[PDB]
Amino acid sequence: RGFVPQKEIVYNKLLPYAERLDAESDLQLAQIKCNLGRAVQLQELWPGGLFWTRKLSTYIRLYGRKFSKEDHVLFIKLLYELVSIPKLEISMMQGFARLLINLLKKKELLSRADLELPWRPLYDMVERILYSKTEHLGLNWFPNSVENILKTLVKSCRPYFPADATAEMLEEWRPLMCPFDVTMQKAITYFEIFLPTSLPPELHHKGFKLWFDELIGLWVSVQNLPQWEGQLVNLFARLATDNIGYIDWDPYVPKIFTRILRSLNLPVGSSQVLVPRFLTNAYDIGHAVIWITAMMGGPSKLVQKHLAGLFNSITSFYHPSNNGRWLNKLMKLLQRLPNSVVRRLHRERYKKPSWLTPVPDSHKLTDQDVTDFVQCIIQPVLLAMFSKTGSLEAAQALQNLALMRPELVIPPVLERTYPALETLTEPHQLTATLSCVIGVARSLVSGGRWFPEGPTHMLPLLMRALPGVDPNDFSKCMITFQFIATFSTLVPLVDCSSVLQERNDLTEVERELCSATAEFEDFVLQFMDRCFGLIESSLESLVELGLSSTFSTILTQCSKEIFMVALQKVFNFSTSHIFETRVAGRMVADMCRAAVKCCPEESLKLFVPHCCSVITQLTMNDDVLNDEELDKELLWNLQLLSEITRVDGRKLLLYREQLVKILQRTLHLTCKQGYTLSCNLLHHLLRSTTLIYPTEYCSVPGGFDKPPSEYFPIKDWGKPGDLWNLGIQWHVPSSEEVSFAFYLLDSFLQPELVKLQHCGDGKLEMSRDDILQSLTIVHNCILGSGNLLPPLKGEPVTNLVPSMVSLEETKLYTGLEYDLSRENHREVIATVIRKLLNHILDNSEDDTKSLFLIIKIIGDLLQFQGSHKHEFDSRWKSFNLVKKSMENRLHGKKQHIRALLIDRVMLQHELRTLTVEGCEYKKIHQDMIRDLLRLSTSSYSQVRNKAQQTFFAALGAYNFCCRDIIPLVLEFLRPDRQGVTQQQFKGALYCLLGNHSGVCLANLHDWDCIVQTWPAIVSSGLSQAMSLEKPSIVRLFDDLAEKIHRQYETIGLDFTIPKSCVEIAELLQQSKNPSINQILLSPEKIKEGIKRQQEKNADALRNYENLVDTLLDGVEQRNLPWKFEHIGIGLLSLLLRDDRVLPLRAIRFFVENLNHDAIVVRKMAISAVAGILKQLKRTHKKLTINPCEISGCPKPTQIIAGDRPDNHWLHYDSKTIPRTKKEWESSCFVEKTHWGYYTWPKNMVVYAGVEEQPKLGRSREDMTEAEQIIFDHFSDPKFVEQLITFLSLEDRKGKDKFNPRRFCLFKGIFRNFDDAFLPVLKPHLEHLVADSHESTQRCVAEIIAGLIRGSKHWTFEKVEKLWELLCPLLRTALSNITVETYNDWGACIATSCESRDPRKLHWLFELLLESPLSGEGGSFVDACRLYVLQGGLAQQEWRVPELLHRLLKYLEPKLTQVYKNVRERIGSVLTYIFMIDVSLPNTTPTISPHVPEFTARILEKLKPLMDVDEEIQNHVDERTQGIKLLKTILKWLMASAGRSFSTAVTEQLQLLPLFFKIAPVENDNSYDELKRDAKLCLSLMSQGLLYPHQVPLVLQVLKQTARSSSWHARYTVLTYLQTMVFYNLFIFLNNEDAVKDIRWLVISLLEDEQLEVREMAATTLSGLLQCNFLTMDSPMQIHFEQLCKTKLPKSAELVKRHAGVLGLGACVLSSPYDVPTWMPQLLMNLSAHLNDPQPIEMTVKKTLSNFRRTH
Ligand SMILES: O=P(O)(O)O[C@H]1[C@H](OP(=O)(O)O)[C@@H](OP(=O)(O)O)[C@H](OP(=O)(O)OP(=O)(O)O)[C@H](OP(=O)(O)OP(=O)(O)O)[C@@H]1OP(=O)(O)O
Ligand SMILES: O=P(O)(O)O[C@H]1[C@H](OP(=O)(O)O)[C@@H](OP(=O)(O)O)[C@H](OP(=O)(O)O)[C@@H](OP(=O)(O)O)[C@H]1OP(=O)(O)O
């Protein structure tokens, strides 16, 4: 046609009316182009621009793309330039972004030659919304799902960025890469979001080869778990997948795999624990799996060797006995890894050539490369089949592993399935080995040309699973139903066993597989007695969904020969075994309609004459009409006929006459089991006759009951997909059955509609049980015949919204062609039920049953067109669960069982008939929602609750109708509307609360609906039909105020579409592939558009400043309870703008109630006034320095990090602080603590001098008149004494903190006024540091912090006057520090010098590093003043090298001289002293203290402890002070283990052999606080990453101190090696000399003189041999067996036999849950050493007991 579609939805072509969808969707696309290009040009963003955005979205939910490549680009460019507007409302930016994700989601449709989206407006967009500077002060209020929808919005646009973007993302975030602060996190989040990885290989040199070596050297050089390196592995996983025949990963793979194994955080060793170690994040296996599977392949498998080694290391932990907290993530590795290999194989093989860069032939997965993956991973998968958590994530692994290698996967799972389904003592296995045969099923039934036996296992295993259909287990009867249903769609069970005339053309498998087909009667009848007994003895509405699901699945897959036997067996059981009508007859009648739904013409012939005759014989007496019990043979046959008839309606027009006659008599029969079972008979009779649905659902198209059985149905087991030759048998309603539906509606709806219309009059005094009956008939008649009768129409409601483009409904066809010459039957029913609602709600108020049906009939007159929304939702959910469990992912043409592939076209039809867009609100619908409200606010709470759910669904159905009813919900909660009721008020505010996932009506988006609602919701506190004494009314106003504060998004006040969005929108309304011929836009109304928009964002301003004023008028209204003013202030606290300053009266309000008598309002006021002082801040001017213009040096290239010469002037040096006003005014003062560490930015800001800054010290006449209010309050003593009285008061005793909310209050005070308030404050905070209270010291710490941070932009005279004040204040405050107080001054000082220049606040450091370790106050103030100082030197990282040298020079004389609580602080402080000496790549050696230089001076001092003769542990010269030193440095290494970037440097390694001989052996019990201190330090230090150059050095240390004379030392080096290998194990496995050194070390220590170290060496040999780090050699057996034969000595002799026996025991204990081939001969050798004397006897006995307890 006129344009080329671009990946349509396939399922639109398969509809019965698919000829109509071409002419329809071309018109809708033309309207979307026209009224989106108009709407952006017009800047009608709210009613028109966001409308046709929302209608373009539902054009893609319905039709796929179906627009040109030329026109796809136009939508992308328009909604990209329009989603990135620098001050655009974030609330409606959500819709533009969600469409823009949806337009770039399928990446293969554009090609970078069609689209070149810039990256800068996305970065300015994320900075505004992820690193917002005003959200924490409460001025912005984003939606909650924003970060997750913008990180995918940038992810969507990222493959289309310009080629130069990487190089200009690396000059803008590379300056932020200082690893010591929080701005490294910002850099690596922006790299993980923005930095492009999918570029063609023609320009890899402008992509990842411009940052990769840098960023992965940065990745490898750290050993912590920073929160940014998990951001960084998310980045390399994306890089590895997109570029696979490229970056080698070969130097890196032994580090990726070993960090993944560390992330699995398996407990290894003799109870060595890691409380300190990072357990929380950084290694999701979703991305680690992706990164593993993208590295394997190519010429060097290396990656497959590591992957096999990984699963050899974890094989103990996948065993079902060994479950733990690790298992939730080890199951994730196992379920996600074969899936991602399936997706790689599909990417490489069965995915078509496209724009995306294809994988090279050199790096595709080969035959052996994927066979080796199956061979490595399957034993943990089979081991995890029997897991206690529930076998779900092993079945998915078995599904994906059987797509690639079914011959390696299926025979083990049925080797474990046939015994499991045979047993009766292990029932955990049946649920395991049947759920794991569900996923293996499509591979099992196919064969696959190398596993042909496959299917022959089907019908044996299908028959043997029949006792699972069980009344006793719900749990196995579910999986048995779900097993029989999945192994019967996969087989046409036509009896193809009468083929012995077919001497050739068959296989020896196919012959044996067709002469087993004859047992298909013996399956569908033995199955069916299992299903009869379960009914006869019948959580249970699922075992009739499963029952009727698998029985309908069976019965469409059986031939007409099998079906007649099943039909006779259904019929005799339903006919002669009379059933109760609640649970058992509900099951039989749904088993009956499976047989009726299959072959409609023969099965219906049995039931409908029988059930009509048996109902006719039992209804004959004519006193059964007014009998209110109905003897229960009529109930069952009436239920049977009721559900027998939801079938193909064309095949039921034969039984037309004598089925209306069964409705002529039973509908008016007074028993609500029996007109209900006869009106749902009427329901299922209409909707079988009216609605469009497929009829067959078979696996083989359009046939399957065919007389020639000479061809061969059992070579078709599978046949997946075939979308094109599909052949859906649709039931489209013919004119005959539409005529039957209207006759059945004119015979059973019209009389009782006349009856209810008279009942609305003064005729027909009608019973309440008779009104309910007639409404029940009307409800089921509408609810069946919905598709025929067209929806409600009428005149449009008038005064809602000016609408310059258009507001048009979507007209979707759905295949029926409404008869408009008949009287619409929705309108007459609405006419009757409105008048009957007036009758009931005025005459019979208490009719709690019919009234509900007025609610349901309003709810379906207004909504229901043939399809239920909830049923379609349930079906959709079911579809993805069935689709994912049968997903042949490897193959890529939507191959699926024809059953769910027909069900998906039916879902496309239901999605099509169910989505009706923003249709005109049309005053007949207004009366539906007026009258509904009358039910929403009614006498009974249950009719209110059910009435509000159809009310909330009525409001999301009509555009601009939430705004229509705002003042009618709000009538009842007016203060002056006299006497509404208690229940009308409670109903109006439930109505105004909404529900969890719909409209709210109290927090709608416009101004015109908040300015109404919020003053009503505060002013409903003085209402006199209002009672807070009721505990539900308090709960709802707390829910109302709680929901709005949770869901307010900032609104509007500016909408101005720029001259870039209108430029690209003119081209979209003039594109001519598809169009309606619409006129060029007149500039007369490109002037009325600006005219309407400028006055539309003018009453946004009017409504905002009106809302603030009337919240203020309401919150102080002469008698209002404290709840409502606490509500009305929090709602007012939501209105701190940042586009404007707050209203003058609200500034007055929040300032005057800082000192309010309620502490809740005081905290709201602290937050609000901090927001006010941020709104009122004067902008400080910046200049640009060249950083080689103050330093005077060439600022070299080849970018190097760390302390440089151009960096050096920015360091704190004690000889260059200004000290005068002239050296201060001529100085640079780079404030941030990261600028210039890594590199300098393109331009760099300075904060220029005071002569150009905003002038400070104003005299209140120069102030901006809202500074007047804060000045006139914060400068008088009375306000300040009340403020500091309320603000030094204890709130939560023991739970109070520093509270940075109150710090932001005083930081803004001393940032806007700065000079006059502290003379008012100096007596108050002079008094406040002298108090030995807790909360008074809290109060002054917040004021001192905000006063120090506030003095950032002051004059030298004014900061000089500030520090003459603050120095004695801080001296007194740190001398009077307390246990209740110390971590509050630690937050005061760390807060007061974060993001500040250290030279500017040098008075802190001279006060606070003078004597932290002094002695007055004793201990604990030495520890806490050295802690308060610690946060101060911690915030000023890398930039204060000396003063960290001054602290090291101060405090090396004091490591010996100090108490227990202080050397912990000494250790944490030395950790923060040596943070800056990093081994990070290309980092210049720091000016900061070096950690090797210090620990050499320690090694000098600690020398007399580590010498010969081994006497240690006295702690009572240069030896006891060495013990005292070793205490302090042991607490240092404690804190250094998890914090420093390069843990355990090469001179923090000679500290080990001295720590080995002093650590204990067995227990963690109380040993001198120096042994247990050395035990946990050793346990905490093996558990830590090593470098590859470092694993020779540590192992050289270990074999040195395993050769010592201390057996405690030789024990603990052998536990150290035990934890040190498995944590970061590969690093050692990527060293052929380290594995040999470790095996020589463990074999050597296995023959020591101490028995304990021999047992420990056996334990660690057995553990290193278990994880396969160490291989059990043939020389290893020779050495052990030649030690076993030593002699009895007639020791030096018995120790050798014990060594050899102990090594053999290590070898047989290394395989706990498996006997390998070498074990039986090896275990006979240990049997010859039982009577071998002690200690060999105990080793043999413990070894063999430990053997056979696990085998
Ligand atoms: O309509 P649904 O239910 O939301 O699900 C859609 C998905 O959502 P979307 O249409 O974008 O909203 C979309 O997947 P993503 O875009 O997220 O990747 C399609 O993938 P695509 O076809 O582009 O990708 P490929 O073909 O798998 O390579 C379809 O996934 P497959 O079945 O794997 O694809 P097949 O339809 O079988 O061809 C799937 O069609 P179904 O309706 O049958 O589930
Ligand atoms: O002094 P700090 O506590 O470090 O806070 C500053 C300060 O913001 P406030 O004055 O609102 O606290 C800067 O404002 P000026 O003093 O330079 O006017 C602001 O810079 P911008 O106003 O240019 O945003 C900067 O924010 P940023 O670091 O994003 O530039 C921000 O630092 P924090 O982000 O650490 O608060």
Author numbering: 24 to 561, 578 to 1555, 1565 to 1738, 1753 to 1813
Sentences from the paper on this structure:
PA200 is a 200-kDa monomeric nuclear protein involved in spermatogenesis, DNA double-strand breaks (DSBs) repair, maintenance of mitochondrial inheritance, and proteasome maturation and assembly. Although proteasomes generally catalyze ATP- and ubiquitin-dependent proteolysis, the proteasomes containing the activator PA200 can catalyze the ubiquitin-independent degradation of acetylated (AC) histones by using its bromodomain (BRD)-like (BRDL) domain for recognition and binding. Here, in an effort to understand the mechanism underlying interaction between PA200 and 20S, we used cryo–electron microscopy (cryo-EM) to characterize the 2.72 Å–resolution structure of PA200-20S CP complex and 3.75 Å–resolution structure of PA200.
PA200 is shaped as a dome-like structure composed almost entirely of α-turn-α modules known as 32 HEAT repeat (HR)-like modules. Although the resolution of PA200 was much lower than that of PA200-20S complex, the overall comparison of PA200 and the PA200-20S complex gave an RMSD of 0.78 Å with 1,719 aligned residues. Some regions (i.e., residues 562–575, 1,809–1,843) vanished in PA200 but were evident in the PA200-20S complex, suggesting that these flexible regions tend to be stabilized by intermolecular interactions. Surprisingly, there are other two pores with prominent openings (henceforth referred to as openings 1 and 2) located on PA200. Even more surprising is that the side chains of several positively charged residues outlining the two openings point toward the center of the respective openings, where they bind notably well-defined densities. The refinement indicated that the density map bound by opening 2 corresponded to InsP6, whereas the density map bound by opening 1 was identified as 5,6[PP]2-InsP4 (C6H20O30P8) because of extra densities at two adjacent groups. In the human PA200, although the 82-residue BRDL domain folds into the same geometry as typical human BRDs, it does not share significant sequence homology with them.
